[PDB]
Design an enzyme around this catalytic site. Sequence first.
Site, PDB file in Angstrom:
ATOM      1  N   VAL A 459     135.501  76.035 -41.134  1.00 13.06           N
ATOM      2  CA  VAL A 459     136.287  76.493 -42.364  1.00 13.06           C
ATOM      3  C   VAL A 459     135.439  77.036 -43.155  1.00 13.06           C
ATOM      4  O   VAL A 459     134.546  76.662 -43.563  1.00 13.06           O
ATOM      5  CB  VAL A 459     137.058  75.270 -42.934  1.00 13.06           C
ATOM      6  CG1 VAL A 459     137.704  75.534 -44.137  1.00 13.06           C
ATOM      7  CG2 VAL A 459     137.926  74.400 -41.900  1.00 13.06           C
ATOM      8  N   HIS A 460     135.589  78.449 -43.648  1.00 11.66           N
ATOM      9  CA  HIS A 460     134.656  79.164 -44.415  1.00 11.66           C
ATOM     10  C   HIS A 460     135.154  79.639 -45.725  1.00 11.66           C
ATOM     11  O   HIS A 460     136.462  80.079 -45.925  1.00 11.66           O
ATOM     12  CB  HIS A 460     134.168  80.486 -43.769  1.00 11.66           C
ATOM     13  CG  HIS A 460     133.260  81.391 -44.419  1.00 11.66           C
ATOM     14  ND1 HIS A 460     131.877  81.009 -44.417  1.00 11.66           N
ATOM     15  CD2 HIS A 460     133.379  82.742 -44.673  1.00 11.66           C
ATOM     16  CE1 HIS A 460     131.100  81.929 -44.941  1.00 11.66           C
ATOM     17  NE2 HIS A 460     132.131  83.018 -45.200  1.00 11.66           N
ATOM     18  N   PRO A 461     134.605  79.590 -46.738  1.00  7.61           N
ATOM     19  CA  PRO A 461     132.968  79.000 -46.845  1.00  7.61           C
ATOM     20  C   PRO A 461     133.397  77.566 -47.592  1.00  7.61           C
ATOM     21  O   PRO A 461     133.988  77.477 -48.773  1.00  7.61           O
ATOM     22  CB  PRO A 461     132.333  79.695 -48.095  1.00  7.61           C
ATOM     23  CG  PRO A 461     133.306  81.150 -48.561  1.00  7.61           C
ATOM     24  CD  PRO A 461     134.741  80.502 -48.055  1.00  7.61           C
ATOM     25  N   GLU A 465     131.211  73.073 -43.118  1.00  5.81           N
ATOM     26  CA  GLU A 465     131.337  74.286 -41.970  1.00  5.81           C
ATOM     27  C   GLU A 465     129.813  74.231 -41.093  1.00  5.81           C
ATOM     28  O   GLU A 465     129.734  74.278 -40.031  1.00  5.81           O
ATOM     29  CB  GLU A 465     131.544  75.800 -41.993  1.00  5.81           C
ATOM     30  CG  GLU A 465     130.649  76.308 -42.936  1.00  5.81           C
ATOM     31  CD  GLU A 465     131.159  77.704 -43.093  1.00  5.81           C
ATOM     32  OE1 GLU A 465     131.699  78.364 -42.113  1.00  5.81           O
ATOM     33  OE2 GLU A 465     131.062  78.146 -44.296  1.00  5.81           O
TER      34      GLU A 465
ATOM     35  N   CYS B  54     134.451  89.738 -45.303  1.00  4.44           N
ATOM     36  CA  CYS B  54     133.775  88.503 -45.685  1.00  4.44           C
ATOM     37  C   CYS B  54     132.803  88.481 -46.856  1.00  4.44           C
ATOM     38  O   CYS B  54     133.158  87.946 -47.861  1.00  4.44           O
ATOM     39  CB  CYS B  54     132.846  87.980 -44.623  1.00  4.44           C
ATOM     40  SG  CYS B  54     132.494  86.155 -44.807  1.00  4.44           S
TER      41      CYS B  54
END
Lengths: 490, 491
Positions: A459-461, A465, B54
Amino acid sequence: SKAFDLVVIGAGSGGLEAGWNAATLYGKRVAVVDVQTSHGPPFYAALGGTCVNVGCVPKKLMVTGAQYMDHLRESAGFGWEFDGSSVKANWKKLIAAKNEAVLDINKSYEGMFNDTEGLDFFLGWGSLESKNVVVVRETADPKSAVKERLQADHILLATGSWPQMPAIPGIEHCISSNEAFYLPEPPRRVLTVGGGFISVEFAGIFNAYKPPGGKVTLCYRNNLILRGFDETIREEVTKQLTANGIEIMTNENPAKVSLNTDGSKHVTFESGKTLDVDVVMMAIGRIPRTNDLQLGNVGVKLTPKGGVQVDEFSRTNVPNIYAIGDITDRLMLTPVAINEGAALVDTVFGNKPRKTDHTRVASAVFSIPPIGTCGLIEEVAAKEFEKVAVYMSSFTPLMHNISGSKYKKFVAKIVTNHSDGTVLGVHLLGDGAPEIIQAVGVCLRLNAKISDFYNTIGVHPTSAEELCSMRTPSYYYVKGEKMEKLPDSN
Amino acid sequence: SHMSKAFDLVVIGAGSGGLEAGWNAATLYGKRVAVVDVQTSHGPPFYAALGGTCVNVGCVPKKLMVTGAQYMDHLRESAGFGWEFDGSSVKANWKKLIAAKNEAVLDINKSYEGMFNDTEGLDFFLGWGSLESKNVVVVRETADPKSAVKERLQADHILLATGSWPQMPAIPGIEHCISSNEAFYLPEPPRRVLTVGGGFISVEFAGIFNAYKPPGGKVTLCYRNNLILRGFDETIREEVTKQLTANGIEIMTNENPAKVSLNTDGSKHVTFESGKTLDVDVVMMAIGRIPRTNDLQLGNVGVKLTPKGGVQVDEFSRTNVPNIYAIGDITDRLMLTPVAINEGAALVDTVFGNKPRKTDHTRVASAVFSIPPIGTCGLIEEVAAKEFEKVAVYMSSFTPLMHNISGSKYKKFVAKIVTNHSDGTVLGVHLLGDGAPEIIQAVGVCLRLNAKISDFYNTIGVHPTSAEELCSMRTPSYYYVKGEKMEKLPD
Ligand SMILES: Cc1cc2nc3c(=O)[nH]c(=O)nc-3n(C[C@H](O)[C@H](O)[C@H](O)COP(=O)(O)OP(=O)(O)OC[C@H]3O[C@@H](n4cnc5c(N)ncnc54)[C@H](O)[C@@H]3O)c2cc1C
Ligand SMILES: Cc1cc2nc3c(=O)[nH]c(=O)nc-3n(C[C@H](O)[C@H](O)[C@H](O)COP(=O)(O)OP(=O)(O)OC[C@H]3O[C@@H](n4cnc5c(N)ncnc54)[C@H](O)[C@@H]3O)c2cc1C
Ligand SMILES: NC(=O)C1=CN([C@@H]2O[C@H](COP(=O)(O)OP(=O)(O)OC[C@H]3O[C@@H](n4cnc5c(N)ncnc54)[C@H](OP(=O)(O)O)[C@@H]3O)[C@@H](O)[C@H]2O)C=CC1
Ligand SMILES: NC(=O)C1=CN([C@@H]2O[C@H](COP(=O)(O)OP(=O)(O)OC[C@H]3O[C@@H](n4cnc5c(N)ncnc54)[C@H](OP(=O)(O)O)[C@@H]3O)[C@@H](O)[C@H]2O)C=CC1
Ligand SMILES: N[C@@H](CCC(=O)N[C@@H](CS)C(=O)NCC(=O)NCCCCNCCCNC(=O)CNC(=O)[C@H](CS)NC(=O)CC[C@H](N)C(=O)O)C(=O)O
Ligand SMILES: N[C@@H](CCC(=O)N[C@@H](CS)C(=O)NCC(=O)NCCCCNCCCNC(=O)CNC(=O)[C@H](CS)NC(=O)CC[C@H](N)C(=O)O)C(=O)O
């Protein structure tokens, strides 16, 4: 002369769980005895136990308060501006808010007794008069007046534990955690004595609420605090405490405490060092409270260390007499006392017998920063298993790139039997550790392997993780010996 | 007249998936790899860059900004624990938040540059990659296919990894609206902002704007249907709606912009399909992201698309064209950074490793960094109940310890376990409340191991935490039997 299926001495986590289950799940008639109906002096514990009154709950509320020292500072890195010279930590307000929330819990346990049929509460001091008779007296003194005599098919001993105080000259000038919860003012200078849970947790509370110019000192008898925890994490929490202004005094132990005329305490260490502080808080262990139960009256056996001896199923050597929770000195945690009491009721009054599993219990230190751990540390693994792999990650969490708290490293470690990849222990340091580790407790019930972690998608961030991003061991133990690399292909 | 630079692999898109693929192919498999991206650091004009959505305009800066936004609550909640300070001096400085975020993103950009300079067999090409033919990638000066060719690269294998891009509705005045891209660079925090959409991005940014808005400000989120966050647990959709409200965000349901005009002061005049109107300083469209397929010139080689515009792939990320693969958001399978990473790693293992492997898109744990946050893994009850004859729902909703004192009583933590009642297998776990993203991670491992409700129940709680509530539930709140919701199993 009232008769009950079950009489519980001690209205705490283990005792209340047993009492409520027996009355509500099983229709039994239940008496529960305790010394006070709500928190605080003189007996500290009360309805709801150490957890509610002078333990998990107020400690957690007060560590939560202490965390704002950090929040208010770290806010500036995210563009928050306010008058920093106007900040003060008001301890009296903290204590009042904690008092009120604990009082709410006490009244709600009172509510439970009043609203539940066959669950009755008796105020006083319970002890064993005989096999099937619990006596309730006015005080801890067995010669005090009798208030009730409860007869009992089954008797549950759940009186918990109590702060241990070493027998040094001047110990009467020291306090324990009990008094810590009610200090009228926060100490300017405080010595926390001990390198375990309570000393570390309170060191962080006193650190945040100390008046200007104040100083927290924690002292520990050996080299490195938190013995029994992951060693990298022992070292790293030592560093992070030091970085937030707490002085960690290792290889030191008080030998004598003197009262100064002005109310401060003069401490002499076994080394002959001395230090003057306002408060000396002793946190060197808790021991079972067996002494007031008059156990000789019926011959209930104790362990060498002073705990009530019980089998796997919480049975004493006396049939119909049981003990659970800290009185047994097995694992002194609220959730374990609970599981113990629930398993004892299921066994006595139910279908199938149940025993509590004291292995792979996840737990946490609410230090700043906090610890979360489940399972075996690597030096213990290395003696039971020929090959141990250790996976280790230590990183600056995302936000501490800009908060200003550069010292705040998150540590994640997984310890496996390298022969099959079975995970034996997980150890975590940094914010979120207590929350993250919970479901890890579940994974160890399911024969989880390292690849079960690394093949699970991140699971990010998050900090968490990192547990699922570790593929390659950092080092190993082979036959007990620590080494960077494996020697052989096997 | 002279040789092109030649690679085992050319990756177009230096983002989450493409970097994982490129790094793994170079470092685990000794391949010669080129990776192409349009900018070497974050920001206008192109927004994404080396490191992807990201790093540049997604997970990383978003989370730094939500973390900033949470101090609005911390500063207010600290009073209950006895913190005192001058309330009237508090000001949220957006310009400082952005500059701090920019520097942190730039350092990550720079570390990726250094990753290329330091890894032999791993090369970076700046520009716009397209497929000229089945083993030739061209790198052009701009997205225009007629702009000058900077490099013509010989490629044995070609990975398509150009991610996604915000969708903008075709309404009059769409030119006055922004997307998440511009939101990251606003020079000032907007006083009044409409976030359009009820999904991840509208909801996360509504909390960011909410913390940072200047005094007298208002954040409005509009959503086209009745209840935001479709696809999420229903109890949670409703509870997060209440908690956003309780923090001052206004939620307009059954509403959708039909058009926007510029007012004379530079503000936006939004007219909704319903004929309602609202003036705001910023209109942020967050109505979805679509695969970025247009600039690749896929027609040159016949790479097929799905009806929805994703590059069509099999389970191993192969397109219809041998030696051409697609991973990440451009496949439109699950748009998350760890998914894109997992696909890139799986694809490289399949092509260069010795080890055919596919990504499992089921039971992927994920989070919404709303305030309060959501963490979830596996099936919502209404989906479960269509494929299982008997589903049990275990629900707990509670005020966390600390919020008995903080002043924030509206902050309920919700914990739900969805099971196949016929053997106890956990199908889904849905959390709302602080810590949820962190908690859910190891729950992801639990479902990978086919945990049952009893394994959770049997596990000893960590006390006091929110998480322990997952290990304290033994009795269903209710069930679904043949699709039908009911409190009690029929006796
Ligand atoms: C400062 C502190 C912090 C802690 N924090 C945590 C934590 O965060 N998480 C966690 O899991 N654990 C924590 N613990 C440990 C936890 O509190 C205990 O493990 C737990 O309360 C034990 O439950 P019990 O039922 O055995 O006894 P208790 O909860 O101690 O209850 C026993 C009760 O018996 C009563 N009693 C004693 N003698 C008599 C008598 N003769 N007659 C009638 N009543 C009597 C007492 O008044 C008491 O209320 C903490 C402990 C302390 C001291
Ligand atoms: C605001 C926002 C917040 C998000 N937050 C999270 C979160 O918290 N957690 C999470 O998991 N996910 C989050 N996501 C989603 C996550 O960012 C994506 O799923 C992920 O980045 C996809 O990886 P990718 O490799 O497919 O593409 P990308 O990371 O988008 O990389 C594509 C790259 O290709 C480049 N490119 C495009 N066209 C060309 C061309 N033709 N030639 C050369 N290069 C080109 C782009 O410049 C870009 O750098 C968020 C997304 C957004 C927009
Ligand atoms: N968050 C949680 O789960 C919490 C749980 N608790 C429960 O209560 C139990 C007791 O807490 P605590 O008081 O901190 O006990 P601990 O057993 O955790 O810590 C005792 C500390 O004092 C040291 N010590 C022991 N004997 C002496 C002595 N004679 N003189 C000087 N130092 C000594 C120990 O050192 P050494 O290592 O050398 O023996 C250790 O550093 C905890 O272990 C825990 O189970 C309490 C608080 C928080
Ligand atoms: N923390 C994380 O994991 C994050 C992940 N992401 C990833 O990127 C993806 C894109 O985010 P986002 O832009 O929020 O997309 P989403 O698909 O999550 O949400 C889009 C929202 O807009 C609505 N919508 C769709 N089409 C229209 C339209 N034509 N007009 C008006 N409204 C419409 C949808 O409503 P409806 O219910 O009607 O379909 C939905 O409420 C996310 O789904 C996620 O995969 C992004 C941010 C954070
Ligand atoms: N099992 C509880 C954990 C709560 C707990 O540990 N309570 C302690 C007192 S601090 C205890 O000793 N409990 C045993 C007991 O009282 N048994 C008799 C009743 C048993 C059945 N009653 C329902 C139990 C399930 N739910 C609760 O008990 C509701 N919450 C609480 O009792 C506590 C009161 S302090 N709240 C919390 O712990 C807050 C929720 C979360 N843990 C957090 O930390 O935010 C749960 O997870 O729901
Ligand atoms: N497991 C990593 C994931 C980080 C991540 O997902 N990064 C994204 C970009 S935001 C990505 O696309 N990564 C693919 C990639 O770059 N692949 C090629 C090289 C990877 C091979 N190297 C392995 C080393 C892994 N460590 C990192 O990649 C360093 N992490 C970071 O720099 C990220 C920000 S990019 N920090 C964090 O994620 C902070 C730690 C924790 N996740 C938290 O959020 O606090 C982590 O938790 O850090």
